[PDB]
PDB file of C-alpha atoms (C1' of nucleotides) in Angstrom:
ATOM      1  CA  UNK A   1      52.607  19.732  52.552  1.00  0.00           C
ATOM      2  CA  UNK A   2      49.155  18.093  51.501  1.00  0.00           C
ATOM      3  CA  UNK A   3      48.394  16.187  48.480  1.00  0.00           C
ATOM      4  CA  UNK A   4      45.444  17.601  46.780  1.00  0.00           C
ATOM      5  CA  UNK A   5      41.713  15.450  47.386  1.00  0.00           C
ATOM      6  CA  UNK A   6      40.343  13.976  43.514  1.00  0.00           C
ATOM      7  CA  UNK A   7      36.740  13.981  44.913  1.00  0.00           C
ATOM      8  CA  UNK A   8      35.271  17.533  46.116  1.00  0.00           C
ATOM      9  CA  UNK A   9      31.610  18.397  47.059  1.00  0.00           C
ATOM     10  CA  UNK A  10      29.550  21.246  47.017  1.00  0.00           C
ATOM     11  CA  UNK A  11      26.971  21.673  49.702  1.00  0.00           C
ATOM     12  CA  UNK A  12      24.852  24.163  48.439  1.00  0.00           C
ATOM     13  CA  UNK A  13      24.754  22.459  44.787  1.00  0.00           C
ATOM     14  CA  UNK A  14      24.092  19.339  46.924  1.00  0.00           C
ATOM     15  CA  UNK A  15      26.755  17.796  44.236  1.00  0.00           C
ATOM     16  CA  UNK A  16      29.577  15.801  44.626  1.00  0.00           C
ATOM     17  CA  UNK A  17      32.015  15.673  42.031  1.00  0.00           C
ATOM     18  CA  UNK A  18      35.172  13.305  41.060  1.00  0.00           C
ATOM     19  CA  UNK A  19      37.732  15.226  38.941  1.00  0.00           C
ATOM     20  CA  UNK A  20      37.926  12.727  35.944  1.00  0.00           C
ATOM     21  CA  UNK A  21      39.833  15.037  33.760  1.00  0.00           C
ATOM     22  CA  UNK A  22      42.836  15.215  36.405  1.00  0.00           C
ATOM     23  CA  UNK A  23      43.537  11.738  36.527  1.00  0.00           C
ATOM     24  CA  UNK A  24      42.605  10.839  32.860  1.00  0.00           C
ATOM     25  CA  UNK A  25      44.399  13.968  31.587  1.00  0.00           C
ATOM     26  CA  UNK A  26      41.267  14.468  29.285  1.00  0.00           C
ATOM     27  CA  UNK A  27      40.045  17.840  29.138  1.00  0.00           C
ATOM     28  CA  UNK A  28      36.662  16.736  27.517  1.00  0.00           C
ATOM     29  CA  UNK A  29      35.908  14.698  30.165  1.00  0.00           C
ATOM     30  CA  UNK A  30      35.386  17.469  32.145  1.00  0.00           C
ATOM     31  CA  UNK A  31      32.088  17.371  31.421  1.00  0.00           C
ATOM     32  CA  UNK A  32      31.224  13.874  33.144  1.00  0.00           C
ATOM     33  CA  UNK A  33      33.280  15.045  35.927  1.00  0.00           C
ATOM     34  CA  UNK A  34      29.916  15.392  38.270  1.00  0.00           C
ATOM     35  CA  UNK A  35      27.741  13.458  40.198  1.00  0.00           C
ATOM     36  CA  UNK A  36      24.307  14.173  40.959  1.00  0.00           C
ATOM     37  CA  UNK A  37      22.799  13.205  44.522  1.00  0.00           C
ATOM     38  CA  UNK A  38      18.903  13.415  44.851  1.00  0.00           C
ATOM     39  CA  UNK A  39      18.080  11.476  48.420  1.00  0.00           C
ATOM     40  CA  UNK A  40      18.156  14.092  51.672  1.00  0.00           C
ATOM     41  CA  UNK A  41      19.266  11.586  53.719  1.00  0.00           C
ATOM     42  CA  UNK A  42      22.228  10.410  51.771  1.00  0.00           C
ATOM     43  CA  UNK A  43      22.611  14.138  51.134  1.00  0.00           C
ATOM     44  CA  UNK A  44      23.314  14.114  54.804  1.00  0.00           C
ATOM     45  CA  UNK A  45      26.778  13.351  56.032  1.00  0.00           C
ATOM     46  CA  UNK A  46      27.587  13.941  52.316  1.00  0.00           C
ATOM     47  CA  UNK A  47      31.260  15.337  53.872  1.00  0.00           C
ATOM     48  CA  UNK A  48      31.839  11.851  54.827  1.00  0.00           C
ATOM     49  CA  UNK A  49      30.954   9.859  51.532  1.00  0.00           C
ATOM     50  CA  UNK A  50      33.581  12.350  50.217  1.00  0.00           C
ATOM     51  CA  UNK A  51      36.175  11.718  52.787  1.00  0.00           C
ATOM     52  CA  UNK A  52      36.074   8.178  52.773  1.00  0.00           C
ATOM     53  CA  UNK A  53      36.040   7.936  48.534  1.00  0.00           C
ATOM     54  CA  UNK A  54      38.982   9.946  48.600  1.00  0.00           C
ATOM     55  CA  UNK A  55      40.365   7.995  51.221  1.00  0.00           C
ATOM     56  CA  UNK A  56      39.717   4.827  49.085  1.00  0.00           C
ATOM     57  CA  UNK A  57      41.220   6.410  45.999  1.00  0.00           C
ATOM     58  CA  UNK A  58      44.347   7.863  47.687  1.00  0.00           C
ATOM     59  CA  UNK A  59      45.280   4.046  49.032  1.00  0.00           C
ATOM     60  CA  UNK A  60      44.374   2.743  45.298  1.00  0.00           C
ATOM     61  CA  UNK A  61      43.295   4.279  42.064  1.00  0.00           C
ATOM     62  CA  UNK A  62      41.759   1.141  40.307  1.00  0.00           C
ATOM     63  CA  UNK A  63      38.593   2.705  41.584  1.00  0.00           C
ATOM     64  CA  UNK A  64      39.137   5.150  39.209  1.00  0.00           C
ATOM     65  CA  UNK A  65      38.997   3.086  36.408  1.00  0.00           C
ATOM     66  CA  UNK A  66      35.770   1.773  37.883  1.00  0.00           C
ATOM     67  CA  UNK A  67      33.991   4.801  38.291  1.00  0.00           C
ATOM     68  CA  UNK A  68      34.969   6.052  34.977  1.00  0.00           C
ATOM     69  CA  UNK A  69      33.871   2.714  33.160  1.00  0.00           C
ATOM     70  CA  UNK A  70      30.155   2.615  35.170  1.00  0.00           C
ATOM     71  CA  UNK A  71      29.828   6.345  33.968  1.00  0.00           C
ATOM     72  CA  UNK A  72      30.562   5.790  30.364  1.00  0.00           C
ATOM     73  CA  UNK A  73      27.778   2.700  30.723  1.00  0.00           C
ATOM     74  CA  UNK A  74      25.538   5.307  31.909  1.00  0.00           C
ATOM     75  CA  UNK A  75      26.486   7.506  28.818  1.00  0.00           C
ATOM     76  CA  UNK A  76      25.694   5.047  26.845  1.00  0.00           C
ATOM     77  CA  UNK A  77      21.962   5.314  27.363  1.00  0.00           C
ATOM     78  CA  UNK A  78      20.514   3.023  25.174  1.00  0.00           C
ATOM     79  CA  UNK A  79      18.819  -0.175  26.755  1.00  0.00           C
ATOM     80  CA  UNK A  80      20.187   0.470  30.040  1.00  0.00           C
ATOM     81  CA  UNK A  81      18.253  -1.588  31.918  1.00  0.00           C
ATOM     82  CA  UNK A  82      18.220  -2.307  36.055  1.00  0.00           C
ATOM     83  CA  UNK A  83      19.609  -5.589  35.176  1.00  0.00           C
ATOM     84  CA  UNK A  84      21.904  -4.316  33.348  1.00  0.00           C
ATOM     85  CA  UNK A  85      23.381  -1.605  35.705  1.00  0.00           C
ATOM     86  CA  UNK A  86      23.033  -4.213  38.364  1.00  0.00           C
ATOM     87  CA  UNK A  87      25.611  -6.624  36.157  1.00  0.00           C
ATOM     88  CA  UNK A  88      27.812  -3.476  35.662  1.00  0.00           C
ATOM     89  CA  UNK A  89      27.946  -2.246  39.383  1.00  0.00           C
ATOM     90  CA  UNK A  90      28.414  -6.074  40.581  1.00  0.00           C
ATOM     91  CA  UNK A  91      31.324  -7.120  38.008  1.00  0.00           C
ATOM     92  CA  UNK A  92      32.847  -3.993  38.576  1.00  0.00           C
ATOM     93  CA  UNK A  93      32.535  -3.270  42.372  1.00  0.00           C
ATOM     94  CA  UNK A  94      30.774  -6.092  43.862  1.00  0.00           C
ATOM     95  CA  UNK A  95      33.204  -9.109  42.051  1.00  0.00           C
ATOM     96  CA  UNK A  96      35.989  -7.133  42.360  1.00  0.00           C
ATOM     97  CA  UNK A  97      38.422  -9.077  44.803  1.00  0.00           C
ATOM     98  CA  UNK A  98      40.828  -5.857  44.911  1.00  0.00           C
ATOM     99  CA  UNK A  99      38.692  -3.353  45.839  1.00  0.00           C
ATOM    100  CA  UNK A 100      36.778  -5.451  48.867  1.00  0.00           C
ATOM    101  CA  UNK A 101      40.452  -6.697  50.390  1.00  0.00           C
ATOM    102  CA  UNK A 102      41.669  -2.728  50.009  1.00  0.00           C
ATOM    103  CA  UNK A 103      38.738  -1.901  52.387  1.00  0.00           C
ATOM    104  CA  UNK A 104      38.904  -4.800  54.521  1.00  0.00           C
ATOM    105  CA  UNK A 105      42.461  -4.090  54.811  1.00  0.00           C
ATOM    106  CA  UNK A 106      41.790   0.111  55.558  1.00  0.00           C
ATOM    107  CA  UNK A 107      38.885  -1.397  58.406  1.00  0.00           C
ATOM    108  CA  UNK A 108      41.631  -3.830  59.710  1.00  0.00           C
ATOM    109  CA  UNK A 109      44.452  -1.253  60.176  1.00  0.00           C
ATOM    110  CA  UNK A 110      42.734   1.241  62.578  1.00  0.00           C
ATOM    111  CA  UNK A 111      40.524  -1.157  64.200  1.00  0.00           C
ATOM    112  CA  UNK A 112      40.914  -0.041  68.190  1.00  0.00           C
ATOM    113  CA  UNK A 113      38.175  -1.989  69.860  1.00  0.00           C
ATOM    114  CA  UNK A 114      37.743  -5.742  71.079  1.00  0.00           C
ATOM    115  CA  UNK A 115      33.836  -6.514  71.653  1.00  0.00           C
TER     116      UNK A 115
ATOM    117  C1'  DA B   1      12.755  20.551  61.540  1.00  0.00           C
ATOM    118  C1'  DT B   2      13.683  20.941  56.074  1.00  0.00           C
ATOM    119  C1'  DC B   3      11.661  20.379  51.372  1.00  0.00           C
ATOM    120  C1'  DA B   4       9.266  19.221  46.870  1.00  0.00           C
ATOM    121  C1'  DC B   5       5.027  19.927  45.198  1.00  0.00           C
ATOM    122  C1'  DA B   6       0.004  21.850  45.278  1.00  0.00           C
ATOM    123  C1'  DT B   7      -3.051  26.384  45.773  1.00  0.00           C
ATOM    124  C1'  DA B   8      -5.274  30.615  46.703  1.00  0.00           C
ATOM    125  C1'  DT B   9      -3.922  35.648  45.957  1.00  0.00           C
ATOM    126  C1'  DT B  10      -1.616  39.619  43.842  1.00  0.00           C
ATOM    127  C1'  DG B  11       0.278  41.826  39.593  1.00  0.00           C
ATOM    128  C1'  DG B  12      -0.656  42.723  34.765  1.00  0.00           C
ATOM    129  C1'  DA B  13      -2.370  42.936  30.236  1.00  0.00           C
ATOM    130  C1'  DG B  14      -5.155  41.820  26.669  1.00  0.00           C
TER     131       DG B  14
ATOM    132  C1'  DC C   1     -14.573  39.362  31.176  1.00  0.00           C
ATOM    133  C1'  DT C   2     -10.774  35.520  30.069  1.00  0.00           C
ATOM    134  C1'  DC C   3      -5.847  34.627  30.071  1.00  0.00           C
ATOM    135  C1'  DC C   4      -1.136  35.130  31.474  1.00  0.00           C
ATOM    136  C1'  DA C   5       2.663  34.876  34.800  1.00  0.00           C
ATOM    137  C1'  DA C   6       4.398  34.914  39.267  1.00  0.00           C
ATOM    138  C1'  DT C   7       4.248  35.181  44.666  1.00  0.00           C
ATOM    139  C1'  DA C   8       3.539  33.925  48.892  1.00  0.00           C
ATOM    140  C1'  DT C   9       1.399  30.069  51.459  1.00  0.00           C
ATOM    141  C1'  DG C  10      -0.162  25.241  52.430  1.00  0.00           C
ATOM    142  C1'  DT C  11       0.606  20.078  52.778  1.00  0.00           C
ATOM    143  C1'  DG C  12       2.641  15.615  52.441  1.00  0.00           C
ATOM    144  C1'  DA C  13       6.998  13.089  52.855  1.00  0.00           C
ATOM    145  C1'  DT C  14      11.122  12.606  55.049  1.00  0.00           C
ATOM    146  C1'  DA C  15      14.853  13.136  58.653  1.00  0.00           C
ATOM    147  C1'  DT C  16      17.111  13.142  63.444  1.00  0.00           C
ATOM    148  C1'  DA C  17      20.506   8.986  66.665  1.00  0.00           C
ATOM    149  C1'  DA C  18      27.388   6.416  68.490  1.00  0.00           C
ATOM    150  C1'  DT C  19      26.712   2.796  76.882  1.00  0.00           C
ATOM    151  C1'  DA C  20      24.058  -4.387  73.381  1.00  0.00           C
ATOM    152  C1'  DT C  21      21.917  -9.559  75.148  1.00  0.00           C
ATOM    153  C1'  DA C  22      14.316 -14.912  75.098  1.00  0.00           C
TER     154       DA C  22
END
DNA sequence: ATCACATATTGGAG
DNA sequence: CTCCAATATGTGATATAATATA
């Protein structure tokens, strides 16, 4: 009837976590498979940063491979600097033609309003 | 209308 | 007469909103 979501939260852990071992097929990876979420506000409406990731990853799963590649960069841990995390996140997400023209086109197909 | 951190007060033993 | 550990209590920091126009 319904698929099953990839990305699940838990309130009272304040956690949200992105099954990585279900799509990779890697039962190690189970480890990495959550995310840690420290600011109250963004720890507010947390049900919708869920909703809309899996949204995003149900329409395309290159995120995936995103995600998974910006975690193992944070694994790494050795001379991880800002810079470098801010190279990582904006070749991966911010350069990444696919993934801004998949949202544009998710905004443009249920827009309902003329201003 | 919480929450993470600081503090005086109780519990306990040595 | 100190030292330990923990409890309940205090204090700062943060968080709330969805009818547009010099």
């Amino acid at each position: 009837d319904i698929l099953e979501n990839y990305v699940s939260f838990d309130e009272q852990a304040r956690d949200i976590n992105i099954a990585f071992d279900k799509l990779f097929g890697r039962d190690d990876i189970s480890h990495m498979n959550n995310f840690s979420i420290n600011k109250r506000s963004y720890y507010n409406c947390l049900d919708q940063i869920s909703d809309d990731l899996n949204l995003v990853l149900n329409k395309y799963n290159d995120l995936a491979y995103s995600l998974l590649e910006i975690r193992y960069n944070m694994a790494t841990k050795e001379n991880y600097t800002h810079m470098e995390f801010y190279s990582d996140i904006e070749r991966l997400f911010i350069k990444n033609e696919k993934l801004l023209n998949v949202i544009s086109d998710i905004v443009e197909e249920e827009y309902d309003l003329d201003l």
